[PDB]
Amino acid sequence: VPIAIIGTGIAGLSAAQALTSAGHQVHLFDKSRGSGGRMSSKLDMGAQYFTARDRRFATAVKQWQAQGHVSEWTPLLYNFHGGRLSPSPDEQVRWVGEPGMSAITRAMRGDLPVSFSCRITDVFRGEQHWNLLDAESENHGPFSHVIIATPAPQATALLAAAPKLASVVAGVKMDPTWAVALAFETPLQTPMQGCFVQDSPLDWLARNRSKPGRDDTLDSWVLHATSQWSRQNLDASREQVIEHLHGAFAELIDCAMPAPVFSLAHRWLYARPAGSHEWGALSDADLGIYVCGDWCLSGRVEGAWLSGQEAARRLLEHLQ
Amino acid sequence: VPIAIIGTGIAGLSAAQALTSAGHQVHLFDKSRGSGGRMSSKRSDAGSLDMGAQYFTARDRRFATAVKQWQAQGHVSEWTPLLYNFHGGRLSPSPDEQVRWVGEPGMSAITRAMRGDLPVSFSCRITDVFRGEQHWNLLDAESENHGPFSHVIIATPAPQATALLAAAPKLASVVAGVKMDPTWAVALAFETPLQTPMQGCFVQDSPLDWLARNRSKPGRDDTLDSWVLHATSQWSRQNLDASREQVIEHLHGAFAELIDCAMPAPVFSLAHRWLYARPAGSHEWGALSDADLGIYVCGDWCLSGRVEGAWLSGQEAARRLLEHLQLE
Ligand SMILES: Cc1cc2nc3c(=O)[nH]c(=O)nc-3n(C[C@H](O)[C@H](O)[C@H](O)COP(=O)(O)OP(=O)(O)OC[C@H]3O[C@@H](n4cnc5c(N)ncnc54)[C@H](O)[C@@H]3O)c2cc1C
Ligand SMILES: Cc1cc2nc3c(=O)[nH]c(=O)nc-3n(C[C@H](O)[C@H](O)[C@H](O)COP(=O)(O)OP(=O)(O)OC[C@H]3O[C@@H](n4cnc5c(N)ncnc54)[C@H](O)[C@@H]3O)c2cc1C
Ligand SMILES: NC(=O)C1=CN([C@@H]2O[C@H](COP(=O)(O)OP(=O)(O)OC[C@H]3O[C@@H](n4cnc5c(N)ncnc54)[C@H](O)[C@@H]3O)[C@@H](O)[C@H]2O)C=CC1
Numbered sequence: 145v146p147i148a149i150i151g152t153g154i155a156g157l158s159a160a161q162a163l164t165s166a167g168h169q170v171h172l173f174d175k176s177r178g179s180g181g182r183m184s185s186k187l188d189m190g191a192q193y194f195t196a197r198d199r200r201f202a203t204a205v206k207q208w209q210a211q212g213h214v215s216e217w218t219p220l221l222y223n224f225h226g227g228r229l230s231p232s233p234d235e236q237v238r239w240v241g242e243p244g245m246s247a248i249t250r251a252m253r254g255d256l257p258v259s260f261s262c263r264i265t266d267v268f269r270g271e272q273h274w275n276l277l278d279a280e281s282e283n284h285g286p287f288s289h290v291i292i293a294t295p296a297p298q299a300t301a302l303l304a305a306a307p308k309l310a311s312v313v314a315g316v317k318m319d320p321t322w323a324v325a326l327a328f329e330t331p332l333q334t335p336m337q338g339c340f341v342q343d344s345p346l347d348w349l350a351r352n353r354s355k356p357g358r359d360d361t362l363d364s365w366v367l368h369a370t371s372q373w374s375r376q377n378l379d380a381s382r383e384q385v386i387e388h389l390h391g392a393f394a395e396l397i398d399c400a401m402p403a404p405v406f407s408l409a410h411r412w413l414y415a416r417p418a419g420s421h422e423w424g425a426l427s428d429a430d431l432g433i434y435v436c437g438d439w440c441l442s443g444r445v446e447g448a449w450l451s452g453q454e455a456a457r458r459l460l461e462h463l464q
Numbered sequence: 465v466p467i468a469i470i471g472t473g474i475a476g477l478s479a480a481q482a483l484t485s486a487g488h489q490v491h492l493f494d495k496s497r498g499s500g501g502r503m504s505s506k507r508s509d510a511g512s513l514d515m516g517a518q519y520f521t522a523r524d525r526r527f528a529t530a531v532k533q534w535q536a537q538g539h540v541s542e543w544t545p546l547l548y549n550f551h552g553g554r555l556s557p558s559p560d561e562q563v564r565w566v567g568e569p570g571m572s573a574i575t576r577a578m579r580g581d582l583p584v585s586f587s588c589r590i591t592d593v594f595r596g597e598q599h600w601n602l603l604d605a606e607s608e609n610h611g612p613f614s615h616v617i618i619a620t621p622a623p624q625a626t627a628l629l630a631a632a633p634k635l636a637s638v639v640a641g642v643k644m645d646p647t648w649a650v651a652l653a654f655e656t657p658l659q660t661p662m663q664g665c666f667v668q669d670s671p672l673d674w675l676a677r678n679r680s681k682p683g684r685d686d687t688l689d690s691w692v693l694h695a696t697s698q699w700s701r702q703n704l705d706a707s708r709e710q711v712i713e714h715l716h717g718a719f720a721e722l723i724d725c726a727m728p729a730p731v732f733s734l735a736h737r738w739l740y741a742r743p744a745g746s747h748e749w750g751a752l753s754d755a756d757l758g759i760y761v762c763g764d765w766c767l768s769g770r771v772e773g774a775w776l777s778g779q780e781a782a783r784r785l786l787e788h789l790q791l792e
């Protein structure tokens with residue numbers, strides 16, 4: 145009887161990889177149409193790049209490199225500060241999924257059993273097995289154990305079987321982020337490939353074609369608003385967000401900007417944890433339910449991967 | 465700009481009634497096709513069936529007054545069944561001095577009348593509640609936005625409320641700690657009425673804790689002799705993932721064990737599982753709120769876990785909202 149994993153972002157799939165390497169069967173669930181979560185699903189509108197500071201995660205990254213799914217990104221970086229643009233070089237090693245940030249999670253998932261477009265609404269156990277109800281009122285199960293791998297505010301609904309755990313998870317605040325993508329037929333006449341931005345609706349922007357293995361046909365840029373701006377405009381329409389963030393971009397850019405060939409906006413209500421944690425994972429081993437996600441640790445790709453490893457590690461130890 | 469109310473059980477609708485009596489506009493939301501929540505009546509080949517709440521008591525003066533208005537409007541009646549008790553393997557009459565009320569012609573008639581022509585969006589499962597600088601917004605399961613709204617009242621079972629409270633994590637953490645017990649219900653219907661005077665029974669030492677006879681209730685469809693069976697939360701937990709057919713089989717058996725007359729195969733049978741049937745314990749909150757932010761929470765689980773507790777909770781949530789407007 146398989147282990148259910150709810151959420152197919154990096155935390156869920158990291159857990160899935162660990163369980164499957166150990167010879168155990170899983171079944172993955174995601175309310176979305178594909179996997180990846182906040183890494184985006186297979187223009188990189190979500191996570192833009194990641195660092196590896198933890199040796200275990202660094203080892204995982206070298207594995208992905210050897211598989212052809214990540215490469216190093218070394219953009220010409222800028223800072224926008226007090227209304228002026230300046231180069232901001234550094235020696236930070238940064239990684240991207242290749243050919244897109246989505247390739248990492250797509251590879252982790254591989255051919256594992258998965259139910260997409262399946263929003264889980266309830267998680268409950270009988271005397272032996274776990275069961276999931278989805279938004280269509282269809283039952284799924286039996287399952288031997290359950291791993292919740294969602295943003296904290298979306299996990300709370302799935303933890304009704306362990307109210308003390310639910311209560312802890314419910315306290316975890318996540319900030320929203322609006323993202324906008326713009327694509328141009330004629331490349332913008334600048335050497336800038338990325339910018340850290342202050343005193344603006346924006347805090348980050350990136351040039352996709354500067355990333356290894358991307359399609360160079362259009363010059364596409366990703367704009368990420370600050371969480372403060374995002375909150376202030378949380379219920380804005382996509383078109384309004386595009387207009388404001390496109391404007392913020394035109395304001396700071398040092399060159400002409402033609403009309404884009406297309407423009408996109410995407411809102412994450414639960415983009416990132418407001419703070420850091422050291423839990424790693426949360427679990428109720430007695431009941432058989434485990435919780436992981438970036439918000440159990442540092443709120444970065446590395447934190448998500450590590451959190452899912454820890455949940456799996458605990459599950460496997462209790463399978464005994 | 466109206467006040468959003470998520471949940472159209474009696475708590476949500478009690479809140480709605482109070483706000484509209486005070487001259488404020490609301491818009492109701494429910495994931496179900498209709499209102500009533502755990503009071504709603506099931507339509508079926510065997511008539512309207514009160515598969516959730518079976519009867520209620522009124523102990524609070526304020527609620528009794530409401531019940532009497534409903535009575536005078538024809539939507540509730542005092543129910544006077546021959547009640548029995550099943551204990552240590554024997555059936556005996558269990559008359560008492562408690563007044564019990566039922567909706568007429570079905571339990572759903574109460575909430576239906578409370579909702580009236582208030583604006584409502586049915587089949588609309590709210591998944592996220594968030595605010596911009598001025599207004600509140602609801603996202604549903606179809607990813608469609610609703611708003612703007614001036615304030616939000618959550619009137620769902622606690623475990624279902626927690627997901628809607630992310631804008632107020634301190635509040636969510638409180639709500640998330642509230643445990644609710646499950647209940648399995650079964651309905652059985654017979655072509656020939658069963659030859660017993662029993663119209664309702666409190667049951668101990670059994671998978672069942674309650675059963676009631678529909679033909680003993682005013683205004684029901686008498687065609688079939690229908691009975692509603694409620695399992696204990698303990699049996700319900702132990703069998704929480706049983707199939708509808710297994711539940712019917714077991715509870716039917718428990719009923720056949722206790723009945724004092726012959727019982728033929730029923731002509732029809734239904735089972736319904738409530739994950740969050742009632743709060744595991746009592747509370748005294750009345751309602752919970754982050755008024756500064758404009759979000760309020762109510763439900764049976766803020767008080768006693770009964771129809772009265774839900775109604776009162778909703779009244780309290782509205783009263784708090786109305787009192788706070790002067791500070792906004
Ligand atoms: C705009 C943005 C930019 C970012 N930039 C960076 C960056 O530059 N570097 C960095 O390190 N990190 C960045 N992050 C963070 C990084 O993307 C996350 O830390 C990581 O992707 C989170 O992984 P996760 O598995 O914890 O959860 P997620 O990626 O959120 O995946 C959770 C999954 O669960 C699913 N789900 C939710 N509820 C349910 C349900 N009820 N039923 C079924 N499925 C459900 C979701 O659809 C989702 O697929 C960024 C995030 C955002 C939003
Ligand atoms: C089997 C059973 C038997 C009972 N018997 C009795 C009895 O004999 N006497 C008694 O006093 N009480 C009884 N009760 C309790 C009584 O039914 C409840 O206390 C009362 O009806 C609860 O009402 P409420 O408004 O608080 O919530 P509910 O009646 O649960 O209404 C909540 C509403 O919110 C909706 N909802 C939930 N989540 C969402 C969402 N995300 N988006 C939109 N809508 C949503 C639901 O669909 C529902 O309509 C019983 C309950 C059960 C389950
Ligand atoms: N927008 C969102 O929703 C989310 C964004 N993130 C972002 O993920 C990114 C990766 O974080 P880390 O792995 O710690 O990477 P990192 O080593 O690039 O450090 C991140 C922060 O350091 C500063 N910084 C680094 N190099 C700089 C330079 N050359 N010039 C000026 N400032 C510089 C920036 O302020 C940046 O936010 C961060 O930018 C973080 O804010 C993380 C989670 C969610």
Ligand SMILES: NC(=O)C1=CN([C@@H]2O[C@H](COP(=O)(O)OP(=O)(O)OC[C@H]3O[C@@H](n4cnc5c(N)ncnc54)[C@H](O)[C@@H]3O)[C@@H](O)[C@H]2O)C=CC1
Nearest residue numbers: 521549558559560562647666674694695696697741742770
């Ligand atoms: N699993 C279930 O059946 C569920 C039941 N409920 C019921 O809602 C009920 C509402 O009760 P109240 O409004 O206080 O009504 P009530 O005054 O009838 O009290 C109900 C309880 O009192 C006892 N009782 C009362 N009169 C009795 C008699 N004549 N003979 C034997 N026992 C008697 C029983 O234990 C019964 O459960 C709760 O007590 C609970 O039983 C609520 C949710 C789920």
